[PDB]
Amino acid sequence: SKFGAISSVLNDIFSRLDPPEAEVQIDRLITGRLQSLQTYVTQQLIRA
Amino acid sequence: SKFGAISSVLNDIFSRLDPPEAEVQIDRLITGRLQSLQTYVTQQLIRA
Amino acid sequence: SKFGAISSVLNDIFSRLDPPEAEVQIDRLITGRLQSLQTYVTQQLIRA
């Protein structure tokens, strides 16, 4: 998932965009994947 | 809810903003609604 | 935690940036803090 970023590959984001915009894109990706991990952990806690 | 967007109407965002940033704000709305749905589902799992 | 914003202090962000960009940084902070609160409450519900 891209979570609204240009790509799901962090390296491509860093190799195509300058920090000013790469920050927006990487923040999107990191927030999306943090949410995905948090969802996994919440479901694991409930199943446990 | 706007979740910090211009409006909560997808058509408004997609007919008053440049396609450059209209997709960005639409992604914000989508993430907000996905988060509200996940909150609903997590609370349903706990109550279940 | 800065959550990708320039600072974790809201007053510093407001006192050093025009509203257009200030709101972007504040949005990062508010999203991070809201997520912290949501995680806290979900963990509390599971513990309860």
Add this chain to the structure above:
Amino acid sequence: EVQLVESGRLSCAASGFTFDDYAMHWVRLEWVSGISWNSGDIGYADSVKGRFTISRDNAKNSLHLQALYYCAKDKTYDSPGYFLNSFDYWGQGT
């Protein structure tokens, strides 16, 4: 590259450059006439109207025209007014 031979009516044979991209002029210095890349701006002199007609055959890179006459190539593609309008290459004579 530039070669501008005044073969010959007169029929200049251009060479060494892209004939289709530049305006061409006859001058005898008593400038005679000018013509643009697409022949959309054909400008004669006060002494010629009705006598000499300028034209160009871009396919064969030819400047045709119904003191010695030169074969200058314009530095740009169109009629007088341009910050870069000049005769930067000439022929030999006729």
Add this chain to the structure above:
Amino acid sequence: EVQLVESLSCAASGFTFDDYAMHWVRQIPGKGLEWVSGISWNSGDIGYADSVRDNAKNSLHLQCAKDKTYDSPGYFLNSFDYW
């Protein structure tokens, strides 16, 4: 301010002498000042009269007139100011 007592030496004072071009000028009797030479702050450019500085000491020593510009490169603001 500025003092430039002619004596050759001008006793520059009350300004950064090492920030402006100078020109010596001799009062030919009943005639124009007849500029003699022009020297830059660094002395890179030096113009000499067809008939013919130590920035620490603030003394244009040509073996006076101030220039608004640091040097000739101020060739839009070039104008003698103080004699």
Add this chain to the structure above:
Amino acid sequence: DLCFTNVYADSFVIRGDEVRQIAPGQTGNIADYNYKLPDDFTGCVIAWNSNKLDSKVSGNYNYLYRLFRKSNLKPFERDISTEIYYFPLRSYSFRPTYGVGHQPYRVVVLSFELLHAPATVCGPKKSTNLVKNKCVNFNFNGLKGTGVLTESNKKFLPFQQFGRDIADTTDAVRDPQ
């Protein structure tokens, strides 16, 4: 409306277009061999054309630049050397007949740190009396907030202006005056 600590004015003159190089993360001769702004640069770059200041009919030779250099410079590092690389320094020869991208601009770069620390360069704000023991809006050298101010027992040191809690919130402040 801010108080700055390490304010520095860096001044130089460059040939027009190369102003694009005066910014974080730019590449080019100026950004690589003469003047490199840090990637995390905090401050203002102010450039403005100088034709009726530094233009010369005959070639202005007062403004040089390092055309060649072994490597590229580091942020806010200066290379004044002149050793042969080719001679490493050239000149612009600014002329009023040049174009605009070839005309000289005076570039000043104000760089400062807005991170706590005792503040020396402070803008014009005026000041009021110190109210204690009462909820007030307060502004200490630009640190704005709302709360009750009380005399403290904190043992600050001469290099400290603010004290911080585990949340990174300023909870003790040394009065500027």
Add this chain to the structure above:
Amino acid sequence: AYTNSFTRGVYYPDKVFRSSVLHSTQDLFLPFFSNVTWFHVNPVLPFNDGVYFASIEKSNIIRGWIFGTTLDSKTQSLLIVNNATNVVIKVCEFQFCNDPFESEFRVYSSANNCTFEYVSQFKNLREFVFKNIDGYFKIYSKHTPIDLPQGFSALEPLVDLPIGINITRFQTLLAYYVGYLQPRTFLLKYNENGTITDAVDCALDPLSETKCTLKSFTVEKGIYQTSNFRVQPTESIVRFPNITNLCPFDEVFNATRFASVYAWNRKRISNCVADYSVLYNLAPFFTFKCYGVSPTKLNDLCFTNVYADSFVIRGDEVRQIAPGQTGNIADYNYKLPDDFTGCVIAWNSNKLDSKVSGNYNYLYRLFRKSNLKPFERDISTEIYQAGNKPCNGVAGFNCYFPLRSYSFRPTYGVGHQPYRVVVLSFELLHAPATVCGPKKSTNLVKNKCVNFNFNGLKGTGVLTESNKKFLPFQQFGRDIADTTDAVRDPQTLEILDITPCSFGGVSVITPGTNTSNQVAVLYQGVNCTEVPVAIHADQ
């Protein structure tokens, strides 16, 4: 000689007061139990990343230092001398003599251009920390009334100097000890009256890593997941196509005459090296706006279908050459897709296109029935009918000719002056690439952790000979996660599998800090024959 630095060299990392806290700081520190060089009473020791300097003495034998690069007049060197009255600092082109060492005149012979000058104010231990970051020379110091001692003491900031020079070596101006700094993470314990009373060097040993993980100085008995071991890339490689001819940008940007926006021209760019630095030499102040990329990164990428669309418009319409814009130009002349990836380069062309008389070589469509789809061209001249009448015929009332000429003139304001516009459209959708930036290709290293770059796809991992076969139109393979797992080498065209570098979890078994400081380490899901053992800090 050599001696043990113990837990010395901690310095207050910030100017903020803190009390009863455990704060984590990433900075240039002196690693605990480091091997420090002891000199006795001297040589020109190097400046690696910053220096911790100690001096046990009782007679002010040490007076200063001379930091620089060549320490000669050909470069600029920092000078710091402590005369009984003051301290003198001077960055300035010094022809230092060979044995500097009270007659201060026996240190340097000449002092050429000086860009910075500054003046200020039981044996003893004078500890110092010198760092050079972002042009600032930072000094921290501490005096202690006293083999280095074995107690904890923290250094306070003294001065940051904007000296603006590289420092690679230094020398003590005449027992002094010299340790070196490295980027490290430290856990500092602040006291109630705000004093740093203890520290943990997180990278010293497994127990320190456990202490930093738990944010405490005392660890209870148990097994703790501390971090993950990760094999670091040994080297880097670059594999770009062998093409070397330069792209035909001159015949695009440097064209005698551009096209009309209504009949805009498209040029295919292929099999070439695209050096975008050749740009930035156009009509100054030109607009160079990119979508999906940054202009500064174009030289580092590889592109699939590069097309250069050129035309001329009026200046105030340059804003209309962008995704989603509306107007005559964006609706009837030249539309860009909303998802456009590429770059728009526009620049004033008054001195090429304007004609005092009115230039009629550049037309634009003003009336169209429907809008255009992206990258579509309409070169028809039929008469537009705004009236219900059967307009079929010639122009007139409610019957307009669709094309109108710009008539660029030298006397117009900027807004109506001609602008030459070039739109570069390319697909960064990886795919086999023909246009690539100027980049040198190294050799292919297989069966080894490396940083790799294949036609702009960057990564780290191990490359192996793959048994998969790509179809001619395929350049990369993707896995379930949509991360590239296979790549066709641009030069030899062989298929390589990409695998991550060896890594795993590490747990620390501690009997309890109270009981002992011995630890055991469990490398989880690994066999001992595969446990990383690389000696140098590369694993």
Add this chain to the structure above:
Amino acid sequence: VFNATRFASVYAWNRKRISNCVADYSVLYNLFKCYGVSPTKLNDLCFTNVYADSFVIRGDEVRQIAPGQTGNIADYNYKLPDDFTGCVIAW
């Protein structure tokens, strides 16, 4: 403003304040240099009060009615700013 019998004189130029109405600019094209605006977006735009000045000049001077010109009319009769939005409609 487009069918009045006699128009003003450039020096004594008129200024109407068209406001609170629907302005069909497309009714032109049957009678058009627009600056700071494009003719095709004029319809879907809105303004506080369109100030409609009207006058008469000789063709040679039409160029002077524009942003940035400095001729005789542009400098002695009707000074139009170098930057502005509007639609000079001459015929």
Add this chain to the structure above:
Amino acid sequence: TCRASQGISSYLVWYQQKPGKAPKFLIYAASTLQSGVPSRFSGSGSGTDFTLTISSLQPEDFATYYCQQLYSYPITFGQGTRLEI
């Protein structure tokens, strides 16, 4: 007016020598008034067509108003103009 060989741009300027006085200063750069110079003085010149206007006279205005060339090296000033009472 001031006259010269060929257009010297604006590098001319009108100084002022008046009774016994060391050179005065006004309209620097030939097109900009000096510090502390009223608007009663003014002048402008494109090429060699320099023309200094005037609006009023004073007990000191009586002078020998010259020109001076700084478009190129060795400097040539210009002619004098003795204003009689």
Add this chain to the structure above:
Amino acid sequence: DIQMTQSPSSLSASVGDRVTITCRASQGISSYLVWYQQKPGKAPKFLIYAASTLQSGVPSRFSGSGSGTDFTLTISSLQPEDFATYYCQQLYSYPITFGQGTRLEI
């Protein structure tokens, strides 16, 4: 439109003699005028356009400036290769008109 009036009818100098040339015109033609050079027998060449951006590979010494009909050719080191009848060419409008020839001498 127009009447180019090379206003030296001719000039003459020697090696190292910096010589100026001028010509006038009926109406204003701004910078849209160039200067050519006809060496005896040979065909005319190009020197500069608009009196500022000198033609590439051309000895910069040949130069000049001026607006309207004011045009002032200017050399510095007039040399053996700088002796020829130069022309001023108005290009503002059409019919384009040339000069008569400031034939330089030895």
